[PDB]
Design a protein around this ligand. Structure first.
Ligand SMILES: O=C(O)/C=C/c1ccc(N(CC(F)(F)F)S(=O)(=O)[C@@H]2C[C@@H]3O[C@H]2C(c2ccc(O)cc2)=C3c2ccc(O)cc2)cc1
Ligand SMILES: O=C(O)/C=C/c1ccc(N(CC(F)(F)F)S(=O)(=O)[C@@H]2C[C@@H]3O[C@H]2C(c2ccc(O)cc2)=C3c2ccc(O)cc2)cc1
Lengths: 230, 245
């Protein structure tokens, strides 16, 4: 790759990811109905956001779709946890759809995943997660989630090199904030280990979508391919 | 205290050096078990699932003995030890399998006498999808030149990390348990960085390799979740009895 993405400084990588951030959307107004409509509107923004993640458009269309297929629900979930950080005990699906755990029990099948999302929001709060760190983590999910389940060798190499640039960026942010070398490596590990919990929540979420008879609302390969080209 | 925040556990686990942590984890490694001798081939779905179930059930007993020797693990309540093992057991079996399989490209070494290619994974329902994910992880460990000392650190991280976010309590006790787990996880990070610095990696290479290793743990979680979904498993009570025995 002749890629500009691999020439970016930590400051340029953060600036690109901050400028690509989607807005917070409102619910339009059935809990599953509201959430499905919100997710569908978020997906359109997510496609346009992914195209602005440095290195993402260097991939084939097929590899872009594979990464989005694997990451879309993890990306929605980390957004939700980020929006909810400053509302302890609550999930801010949207500014006009803020649910506490009491309302999560009233809706069958909600509460187990609700509780996992609340624990993630609490962990982000306890770590004082910064916006610059959040955008790095969301980009890692996009590039990392599908990379182990793929020209192909060159594509995987390029993804790992962009992932290395995002690591460098996270470490730069922490060094600039005044963290010791030891604190830098410890916080990097703490952030990346939360990604294992977001993967778990995404898998449980998919299983719950299936059990609610909502197989239809998962974006297909073909849907993502058409949205990328459109 | 106000001046020096620490774990509240009455424990030397957090006082270990990086060298002592690696030594403890290496010495705790469970044995490699064999499958049945000369089983009827070709396998059916039932006989393959029979062999794998029997091997996993025997591995579980040794995994409990290993978990008890992970520094900091026995400082937790019995209930929290079982929660961590409940959440991590299949990921721990899977990273063991990927480690054993590293030197056999295209194959999964379930045991020295049970070496399977992806074709033999088709015998069991949706097991080829997970077979292929396990092969890609073994290739990734090969490509990274994963070291034994790194592997034992990663397997201990899985044990402590996988269930830590689903202690949903916020009693003083629960906060102390979570704080202790995060401090032991920080010590294992320090240990991994020490191993990389000792090997001669630059600071930039150390942070990049640390990130590459921890991001593979997200894929092992994925494979474990898909495995469970495809299946439909040690009970709380079974794990609790094995911990006390
Ligand atoms: O009976 C009813 O009306 C409804 C019952 C109900 C039972 C479970 C439930 N989920 C658990 C939790 F905690 F989030 F609520 S979930 O399926 O995992 C899943 C998690 C989160 O909520 C669901 C979802 C979704 C995604 C695509 C879609 O097409 C429809 C829904 C998510 C989401 C959406 C947007 C966003 O920005 C972030 C996250 C949600 C409602
Ligand atoms: C419970 C259960 C959860 C998932 C499942 N799978 C469908 S799988 O992901 O392919 C799973 C991975 C691998 O193939 C399966 C298996 C297994 C594990 C327990 C069991 O009782 C029976 C079979 C394996 C394994 C065994 C030993 C080892 O050292 C490493 C891996 C089958 C059952």
């Amino acid at each position: 790759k002749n890629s500009l993405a691999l020439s970016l400084t930590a400051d340029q990588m953060v600036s690109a990811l901050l400028d690509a951030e989607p807005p917070i959307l409102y619910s339009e107004y059935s809990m599953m109905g509201l959430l499905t409509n919100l997710a569908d509107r978020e997906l359109v923004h997510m496609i346009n956001w992914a195209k602005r993640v440095p290195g993402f458009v260097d991939l084939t269309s097929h590899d872009q779709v594979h990464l989005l297929e694997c990451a879309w629900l993890e990306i929605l979930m980390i957004g939700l946890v980020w929006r909810s950080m400053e509302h302890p005990g609550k999930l801010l699906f949207a500014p006009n759809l803020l649910l506490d755990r009491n309302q999560g029990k009233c809706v069958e099948g909600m509460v187990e995943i609700f509780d996992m999302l609340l624990a993630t929001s609490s962990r982000f709060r306890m770590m004082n997660l910064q916006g610059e760190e959040f955008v790095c983590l969301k980009s890692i999910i996009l590039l990392n989630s599908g990379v182990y389940t793929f020209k192909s060798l060159e594509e995987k190499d390029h993804i790992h090199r962009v992932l290395d640039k995002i690591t460098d960026t996270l470490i730069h942010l922490m060094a600039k904030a005044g963290l010791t070398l030891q604190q830098q490596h410890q916080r990097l590990a703490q952030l990346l280990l939360i990604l294992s919990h977001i993967r778990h929540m995404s898998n449980k979420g998919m299983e719950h979508l299936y059990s609610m008879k909502c197989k239809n609302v998962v974006p297909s390969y073909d849907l993502l391919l058409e949205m990328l080209d459109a």
